[PDB]
Ligand binder design. Structure first.
Ligand SMILES: *[C@@H]1O[C@H](CO)[C@@H](O)[C@H](O)[C@H]1NC(C)=O
Lengths: 51, 51
C-alpha cells in the first residue's frame, strides 16, 4: 500500500521539512504508507516550479 | 523542461541587439534601457471639449 506523493520545499525551509518528517513518523500506519519524493527549489521561480 | 536547462549563447546577443535599437514609429521615439522598459517617449495630454 505505497502511496506516491510529490512535495516541494523552498530552499532554506528547514523546520517545515522537519515537522513534515515528524508528521510522517507519528501518523504512519500499518494499513498504508506514504512515499514522498522531495525536491528543493526556488519557490519564487516559475520555471523551477513548473519543472 | 529538460533539467538542468541550458541556454543558447546567441540569445544574449539577440537581447542586446533588440535593446540597443532606436527608431521612429507610431508610438513616437522608440528606445529602451537595460531592463527593456521604454525611454524618451512622449505621452500627449488631451482634454475632451465641446468642439
Ligand atoms: C531619454 O530617456 C531617459 C529615460 O528617462 C532619460 O534618462 C534621458 O534623459 C532622456 N534623454 C533625453 C534627451 O530626453
Amino acid at each position: 500500500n505505497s502511496i506516491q506523493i510529490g512535495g516541494l520545499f523552498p530552499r532554506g525551509a528547514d523546520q517545515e521539512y522537519s515537522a513534515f518528517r515528524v508528521g510522517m513518523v507519528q501518523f504512519s500506519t500499518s494499513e498504508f504508507r506514504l512515499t514522498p519524493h522531495i525536491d528543493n527549489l526556488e519557490v519564487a521561480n516559475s520555471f523551477a516550479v513548473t519543472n | 523542461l529538460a533539467n538542468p536547462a541550458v541556454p543558447w549563447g546567441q540569445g544574449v546577443e539577440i537581447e542586446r541587439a533588440l535593446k540597443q535599437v532606436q527608431v521612429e514609429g507610431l508610438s513616437g521615439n522608440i528606445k529602451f534601457d537595460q531592463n527593456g522598459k521604454r525611454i524618451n517617449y512622449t505621452i500627449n495630454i488631451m482634454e475632451l471639449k465641446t468642439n
